[PDB]
Design a protein around this ligand. Structure first.
Ligand SMILES: Nc1ncnc2c1ncn2[C@@H]1O[C@H](CSCC[C@H](N)C(=O)O)[C@@H](O)[C@H]1O
Length: 200
């Protein structure tokens, strides 16, 4: 019942119009986007802990959207909105340039098989697209539990002018407060965080 009940309140329909964040959230505040939020546990925890900030989630899996809405309602959140649509299209059509404080991409589909390597969302064009939507100093934070994907992510991100690795060892970062531990959580999870800086 969560979708029918709470989609009218917290859902955002896809359109070819750029989002007005002040209009959407009813105030001027930092916006964090989580792509592929799944059941939304991280996103709800994030929004609950940061009532002074605003949060957008995008997830193609509609039961995940429903679960996220149910949890957000259970926590009485007013600072969370969700979409059920391909995030790439939302980024292109609805997210203004230079507008986001942070983009989170946690455990994106790992596509273990080499035959599926191109299905992995972290590729140069996607990473460039995300970059264009971050404010300077904004961060793209991704995490994976598959080392081949982690290495691919690092290669992609390291190749892009305008991304600065926040890793003190030029690869991975420790898990920040802004990502929750997994039930099973080196220790087998890789976090990557890159800040947007001016083109060199
Ligand atoms: N293009 C896209 N747009 C929005 N969501 C996407 C997407 N491609 C994959 N996803 C979603 O990304 C999620 C990755 S599974 C990880 C889910 C969640 N972050 C967690 O850690 O539990 C899936 O739910 C999948 O539906």
């Amino acid at each position: 019942h969560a979708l029918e009940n709470y989609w009218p309140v917290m859902g955002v329909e896809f359109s070819e119009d750029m989002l007005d964040f002040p209009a959407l959230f009813g105030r001027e505040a930092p916006v964090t986007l989580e792509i592929g939020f799944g059941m939304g546990a991280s996103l709800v925890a994030m929004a609950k802990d940061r009532p002074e900030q605003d949060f957008l989630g995008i997830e193609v899996h509609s039961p995940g959207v429903g679960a996220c809405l149910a949890s957000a309602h259970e926590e009485g959140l007013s600072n969370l909105r969700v979409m059920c649509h391909d995030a790439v299209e939302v980024l292109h059509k609805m997210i203004p340039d230079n507008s986001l404080r942070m983009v989170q991409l946690f455990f994106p589909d790992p596509w273990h098989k080499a035959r599926h390597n191109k299905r992995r969302i972290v590729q140069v064009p996607f990473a460039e697209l995300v970059k264009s939507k971050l404010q300077l100093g904004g961060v793209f934070h991704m995490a994976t539990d598959w080392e081949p994907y982690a290495e691919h992510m690092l290669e992609v991100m390291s190749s892009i002018d305008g991304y600065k690795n926040l890793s003190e060892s030029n690869d991975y970062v420790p898990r920040p407060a802004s990502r929750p531990v997994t039930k099973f959580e080196g220790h087998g999870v890789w976090d990557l965080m890159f800040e947007r800086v001016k083109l060199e």
